[PDB]
Motif scaffolding. Structure first.
Motif, mmCIF file in Angstrom:
data_model
loop_
_atom_site.group_PDB
_atom_site.id
_atom_site.type_symbol
_atom_site.label_atom_id
_atom_site.label_comp_id
_atom_site.label_asym_id
_atom_site.label_seq_id
_atom_site.Cartn_x
_atom_site.Cartn_y
_atom_site.Cartn_z
ATOM 1 N N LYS A 259 -14.771 -15.407 -11.303
ATOM 2 C CA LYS A 259 -14.896 -14.264 -10.667
ATOM 3 C C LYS A 259 -13.489 -13.577 -9.975
ATOM 4 N N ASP B 44 -27.862 -12.738 -0.217
ATOM 5 C CA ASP B 44 -28.015 -11.737 -1.142
ATOM 6 C C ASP B 44 -29.051 -12.197 -2.334
ATOM 7 N N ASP C 162 -23.729 -16.548 -6.826
ATOM 8 C CA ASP C 162 -23.279 -15.468 -5.751
ATOM 9 C C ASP C 162 -23.836 -15.650 -4.407
HETATM 10 MG MG LIG Z 1 -21.830 -11.328 -4.660
#
Ligand SMILES: [Mg+2]
Ligand SMILES: NC[C@@H]1O[C@H](O[C@H]2[C@@H](O)[C@H](O[C@@H]3[C@@H](O)[C@H](N)C[C@H](N)[C@H]3O[C@H]3O[C@H](CN)[C@@H](O)[C@H](O)[C@H]3N)O[C@@H]2CO)[C@H](N)[C@@H](O)[C@@H]1O
Ligand SMILES: Nc1nc2c(ncn2[C@@H]2O[C@H](COP(=O)(O)OP(=O)(O)NP(=O)(O)O)[C@@H](O)[C@H]2O)c(=O)[nH]1
Ligand SMILES: [Mg+2]
Length: 295
Positions: A45, A191, A210
């Protein structure tokens, strides 16, 4: 495609001394981040300094890999480089298939139940953690909104239409009256949508990714997408059943929390445009207000 990759391949080999990139492809991207699959084995990432950042996300993976007892896999950071201008996190790809509405609709009733239980169990275990060791990672959603509202008033508010002002003020009036921020606080993924949930070959939950927005926040936060009615998510009933299985939580308030966050989305979109100087988002958010007003 070809050029982005070469540059990131260079950065990876440069910052991670004896790492050799044999292959590298783009596997996803946000509006200000890009993720790469490297050697068919590692996720990297990456971000070039925004309003961040990857430091917190790293601290969270580290906290969780220490303290979670679970079979569900999450990222485990082997490589990281963090600076004001550039951040990179590398970890082994979690293998599996991402949950989608289509897949869910092909599962037997029992398979669906087991998935729901798996999710409730994971959230129960995470929300139950003593978060002292990550206590600086707090997030006050109500306060954030108030600050964002002030930024609006300092910038573009006076140039908005009456319809847009009424939408915003009506939301703020609702924010002021609600009680949904006065409940239990805990560590949440924050999220928790189905595009971050991975299934194994039996349709059981095998991994979650994530945790980039994770923090100590209202317990209701992790049900916002589970309760969402949309093409991207499974449906309100899915979230309801999960809440029942999870237990000890006011379902009507979770829904209220979700509904309030949904109401806020266009304003959030506008504020992102202001903060990052992107007119496109300011206009999208304003237009969404008109679309919502005329439903
Ligand atoms: Mg994210
Ligand atoms: N990438 C933004 C990160 O996530 C959030 O913002 C996002 C969130 O509010 C909202 O997006 C969320 C995602 O997030 C979530 N993981 C999947 C979910 N279906 C999506 O939902 C949103 O977009 C959907 C379609 N598109 C709409 O159908 C839905 O009504 C709307 N709430 O819109 C923003 C961008 O889509 C945080 N607020 C922000 O601080 C952080 O940086
Ligand atoms: N199969 C698999 N995919 C992963 C894994 N890690 C990341 N991904 C993929 O990479 C995409 C982006 O990863 P994600 O953590 O969601 O980051 P992001 O939202 O795009 N960036 P940011 O969190 O900074 O806003 C995910 O949608 C998924 O496709 C993993 O362990 N396994
Ligand atoms: Mg993501």
């Amino acid at each position: 495609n070809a050029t982005n990759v070469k540059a990131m391949k260079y950065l990876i080999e440069h910052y991670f001394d004896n790492f050799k990139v044999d292959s590298i492809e783009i596997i996803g991207s946000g509006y200000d981040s890009v993720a790469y699959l490297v050697n068919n084995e590692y996720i990297f990432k990456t971000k070039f300094s925004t309003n961040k950042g990857y430091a917190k996300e790293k601290a969270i993976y580290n906290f969780l890999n220490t303290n979670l007892e679970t079979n569900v896999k999450i990222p485990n950071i082997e490589y990281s480089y963090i600076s004001d201008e550039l951040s990179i996190l590398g970890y082994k790809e979690i293998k599996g298939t991402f949950l989608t509405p289509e897949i869910y609709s092909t599962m037997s009733e029992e398979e669906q139940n087991l998935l729901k239980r798996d999710i409730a169990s994971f959230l129960r275990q995470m929300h139950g953690l003593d978060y002292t060791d990550i206590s600086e990672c707090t997030i006050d959603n109500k306060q954030n909104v108030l600050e964002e509202y002030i930024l609006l008033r300092e910038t573009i508010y006076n140039d908005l239409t009456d319809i847009e002002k009424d939408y915003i003020e009506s939301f703020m009036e609702r924010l002021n009256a609600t009680t949904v921020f006065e409940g239990k606080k805990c560590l949440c993924h924050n999220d928790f949508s189905c595009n971050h949930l991975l299934l194994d070959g039996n349709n059981r939950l095998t991994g979650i990714i994530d945790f980039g927005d994770s923090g100590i926040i209202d317990e209701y936060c992790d049900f916002i997408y589970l309760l969402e009615d949309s093409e991207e998510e499974i449906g309100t009933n899915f979230g309801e059943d999960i809440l029942r299985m999870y237990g000890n939580i006011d379902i009507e308030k979770a829904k209220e929390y979700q509904d309030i966050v949904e109401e806020y989305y266009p304003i959030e979109t506008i504020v992102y445009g202001i903060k990052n100087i992107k007119q496109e988002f300011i206009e999208n958010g304003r237009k969404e207000i008109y679309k919502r007003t005329y439903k």
